[PDB]
Ligand binder design. Structure first.
Ligand SMILES: Nc1ncnc2c1ncn2[C@@H]1O[C@H](CSCC[C@H](N)C(=O)O)[C@@H](O)[C@H]1O
Length: 641
C-alpha cells in the first residue's frame, strides 16, 4: 500500500510505505531486474521458442490442446506470450505475492484472461492437468544462481507430462582464457615493491561470489585471448536425469597463443527450442556475431584460477570446470576441486573495484611521486578505513602512523609491515591516540564504510579531531574536494530505469505503476554503477556541485543548480575529485575524448541519476544537493527548473 505525498522541494508526487510494508516494497522495487523487460531480444526469443513448442505439441498429442506452465511469471509477460500464439491453458507461478497480484491484474485485464491463471507459490512447493510445456526465464549471469536447476528438475518430475517440452530447452556455458593486466588487478593481492613473487598475505583464490562485468565495454587492448571458447557445461532443461546439482569436468582445448591465464571469461547461451536455430547468446560484442544485443540484467563474468597457469601455442591444456547448485568455479588439474573462499582476509573486505583501485595506486608512478614529495623525511599520519596509502608514504617518510579503526585492516597492515620488514610504520586504532603531532596528514580519502562511493567524507571529521588536538595549521592532503556532475547520453544504460510500457504489444503500464511507487518508496534517488562498463557521450562540461575545502571547520553545505543539455542526455553521473598536493585525483571522470566519449575510474563506482519520467523531456533539471554536518550524509533531489 503506497502512501501519496508531495515532494516539498520539487512539487513532484511521491510515495512512501509503512515500516511493515518496507521489505516487501524493496523487493518489489527490484522486480524489474533492470532492463529485463525491455530486453527486446530476450523477449523475441521466448516468443519464438513458445511458437515452436506450442505448435509441435498441438500437432502431437491427440486432443489438439496445449497446457503451458510459466515458472516465475513476474508480470505475466511470458504467459501472455503463451496464450497468444496458442496455449489452450497457461498456469503461471510466482513466489513473490505482490508480483502475483500484478500478474493476475494485468493478466485479467487482457484478451487472454480466459486461458491464464496465476498462482502465488514457488514451483518447488506445489502438486498441480500435467504441463505439456514449461517456460521459465529464471536465469542470471551465472545461468544457475537463481535456482534454475532445481526449478526445472523438480517441475519436470512433479508438475509436467512425460515428454514435456521446455523453453529454453538447452544451454552451454563457455570459458575463454585470457592474459590481462587489467583483470588481474581486480583479484591480485597488492604487491608493494612490484615484484612477481611478493606474497605479503600468503596465497588466496580471492572472492568466490560472481564477478559480473560487461565485457563488451572492455577495451580490446586490455586482454588477449589464448584459445577459442571452451564448453564448460552443457545443460539440458528437458530431462530431469540430466540435471545434476554438483558436477565437475576436466575440459581440454588447444591454445592458439602462449601467455598466462590471468582470468577466464564466461558467458552462456540458450537454445530456445532445441532446433539449433534460435538462441539467446550472452557472448560479448567482440565475440557474438549473430545474436548480440545489449543488456544489463544479464552480463558476462570473470573467474580466477587459484594458482598461476601458463599455456603454450599449439599445445593442449586442461581446466577443471566445477559447479554446485548455485555457483560455478574453476580450477587447475590435480588441484583441490572444492569451491574456495578468500582465506587471505583482504578479498572478503574490499570489493573487486577497490582491489583494482589499490593495485592501481600501487603501480601509479605519478601518484607515487606526489606521495614521495609530500612525505619526505617527515612524520606522516594517514586516515581512512582500509586505505593502503600509508604504505606508500613509507617509502620516503621518517615515520608513518596509520590510523585505522577496523581491526581486520590493521592485521592486514601489520602483515604488510612484517612481510616487507618496514621499519618506519606503526598503526593505531583511534584518531585520538595520535599524540605526537605529525608533520602532515595524508589521506586518499578512502573509508571502506562509506555508505556511497561518492562519499568518503568521514575524512573531514577525522581531520577536525586531529586539528582539535594539534592546531588548525596542521598540514593535510588532499586540501580540497569537489562533487561534480555532468549531463550524459548513455547508449543503453538508461533502460535499467526507464518505463517499460507496451512490450510485444502487451500493456505492462500497470507494472510501471507499482514498480515506480515501489522505487520512489525504497530506492536512493542517485543509483550507483561502474560507469566504465557503460558506453555513452557526454553532452556538456562537468559542473561543480559541492566543494569541501579542508581548512575547517566542517560545515553543512547547500547547493541548488541547473543542469543543462538534458533534452538530448539521459542520465547525470556524479563523482568526487580531490587536490592531493599538486595533482588531481578523480573517483569518476578521468578524461573526455574529442568525440565526447568519457573515461571513468575502474577503481570506484560512480553516482548516476536517471531523470524520472515526468522529467524525461526537460532541457534543464534543477539539482538540489545538501551536505549535512550532522550525519555526514549528502542528499539529492532532482526537479524541473
Ligand atoms: N521456482 C520458482 N517459482 C516461482 N517463481 C519463481 C521461481 N524462481 C524464481 N521465481 C520468480 O521468477 C521471476 C524471475 S524474473 C522473470 C520474470 C518474467 N517471467 C519475465 O520473463 O520477464 C522472479 O519474479 C522470481 O520471484
Amino acid at each position: 500500500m503506497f502512501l501519496e505525498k508531495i515532494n516539498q522541494k520539487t512539487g513532484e508526487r511521491e510515495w512512501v510505505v509503512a515500516e511493515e510494508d518496507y521489505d516487501m516494497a524493496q523487493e518489489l522495487a527490484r522486480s524489474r531486474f533492470g532492463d529485463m523487460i525491455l530486453d527486446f531480444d530476450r523477449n523475441d526469443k521466448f516468443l519464438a521458442g513458445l511458437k515452436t513448442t506450442i505448435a509441435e505439441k498441438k500437432h502431437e498429442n491427440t486432443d489438439g490442446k496445449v497446457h503451458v506452465l510459466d515458472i516465475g511469471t513476474g508480470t505475466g509477460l511470458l504467459s501472455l506470450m503463451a496464450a497468444r500464439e496458442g496455449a489452450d491453458k497457461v498456469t503461471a507461478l510466482e513466489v513473490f505475492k505482490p508480483m502475483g497480484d500484478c500478474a493476475r491484474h494485468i493478466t485479467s485485464n487482457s484478451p487472454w484472461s480466459d486461458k491464464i491463471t496465476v498462482i502465488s507459490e514457488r514451483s518447488t512447493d506445489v502438486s498441480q492437468s500435467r504441463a505439456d510445456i514449461i517456460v521459465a526465464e529464471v536465469f542470471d549471469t551465472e545461468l544457475i544462481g537463481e535456482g534454475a536447476l532445481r526449478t526445472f528438475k523438480e517441475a519436470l518430475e512433479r508438475l509436467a507430462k512425460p515428454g514435456c517440452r521446455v523453453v529454453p530447452s538447452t544451454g552451454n556455458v563457455y570459458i575463454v582464457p585470457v592474459e590481462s593486466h587489467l583483470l588481474k588487478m581486480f583479484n591480485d593481492i597488492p604487491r608493494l615493491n612490484g615484484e612477481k613473487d611478493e606474497e605479503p598475505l600468503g596465497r588466496c583464490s580471492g572472492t568466490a561470489a560472481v564477478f559480473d562485468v560487461q565485457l563488451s565495454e572492455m577495451k580490446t587492448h586490455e586482454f588477449r585471448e589464448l584459445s577459442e571458447p571452451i564448453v564448460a557445461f552443457k545443460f539440458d532443461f528437458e530431462h530431469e536425469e540430466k540435471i545434476i546439482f554438483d558436477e565437475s569436468f576436466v575440459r581440454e582445448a588447444v591454445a592458439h597463443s602462449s601467455g598466462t591465464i590471468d582470468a577466464l571469461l564466461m558467458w552462456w547461451d540458450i537454445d530456445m527450442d532445441r532446433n539449433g536455430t534460435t538462441f539467446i547468446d550472452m557472448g560479448p560484442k567482440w565475440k557474438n556475431k549473430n545474436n548480440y544485443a545489449w543488456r544489463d540484467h544479464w552480463m558476462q563474468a570473470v573467474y580466477y584460477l587459484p594458482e598461476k597457469k601458463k599455456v603454450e601455442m599449439n599445445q593442449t591444456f586442461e581446466i577443471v570446470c566445477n559447479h554446485d547448485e548455485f555457483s560455478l568455479w574453476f580450477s587447475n588439474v590435480g588441484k583441490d576441486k572444492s569451491r574456495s573462499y578468500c582465506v587471505c582476509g583482504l578479498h572478503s573486505m574490499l570489493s573487486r573495484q577497490t582491489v583494482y583501485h589499490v593495485n592501481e595506486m600501487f603501480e601509479n608512478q605519478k601518484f607515487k611521486d606526489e606521495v614521495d614529495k609530500l612525505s619526505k623525511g617527515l612524520h606522516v599520519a594517514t586516515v581512512g578505513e582500509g586505505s593502503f596509502l600509508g604504505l606508500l608514504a613509507a617509502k620516503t617518510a621518517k615515520r608513518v602512523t596509520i590510523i585505522d579503526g577496523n581491526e581486520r585492516f590493521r592485521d592486514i597492515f601489520f602483515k604488510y609491515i612484517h612481510y616487507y620488514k618496514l621499519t618506519n610504520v606503526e598503526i593505531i586504532e583511534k584518531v585520538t591516540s595520535l599524540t605526537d603531532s605529525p608533520d602532515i596528514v595524508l589521506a586518499e580519502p578512502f573509508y571502506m564504510s562509506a555508505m556511497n562511493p561518492w562519499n568518503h567524507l568521514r575524512f573531514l571529521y577525522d581531520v577536525e579531531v586531529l586539528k582539535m588536538m594539534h592546531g588548525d595549521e596542521l598540514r593535510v592532503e588532499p586540501h580540497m574536494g569537489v562533487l561534480k556532475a555532468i549531463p550524459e547520453k548513455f547508449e543503453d544504460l538508461q533502460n535499467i530505469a526507464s518505463d517499460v510500457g507496451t512490450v510485444n504489444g502487451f500493456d505492462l503500464s500497470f507494472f510501471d505503476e507499482i514498480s515506480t511507487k515501489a522505487r520512489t518508496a525504497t530506492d536512493a534517488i542517485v543509483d550507483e554503477q561502474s560507469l566504465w562498463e557503460y558506453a555513452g557521450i557526454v553532452k556538456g562540461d562537468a559542473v561543480e556541485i559541492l566543494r569541501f575545502p579542508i581548512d575547517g571547520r566542517v560545515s553543512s553545505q547547500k547547493c541548488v543548480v541547473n543542469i543543462d543539455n538534458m533534452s538530448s542526455s539521459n542520465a547525470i553521473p556524479m563523482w568526487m575529485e580531490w587536490e592531493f598536493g599538486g595533482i588531481n585525483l578523480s573517483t569518476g571522470l578521468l578524461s573526455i575524448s574529442s568525440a565526447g566519449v568519457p573515461e571513468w575510474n575502474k577503481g570506484y563506482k560512480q553516482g548516476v541519476y536517471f531523470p524520472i519520467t515526468a522529467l524525461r523531456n526537460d532541457k534543464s533539471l534543477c539539482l538540489h544537493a545538501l551536505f549535512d554536518k550532522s550525519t555526514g550524509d549528502i542528499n539529492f533531489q532532482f526537479g524541473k527548473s
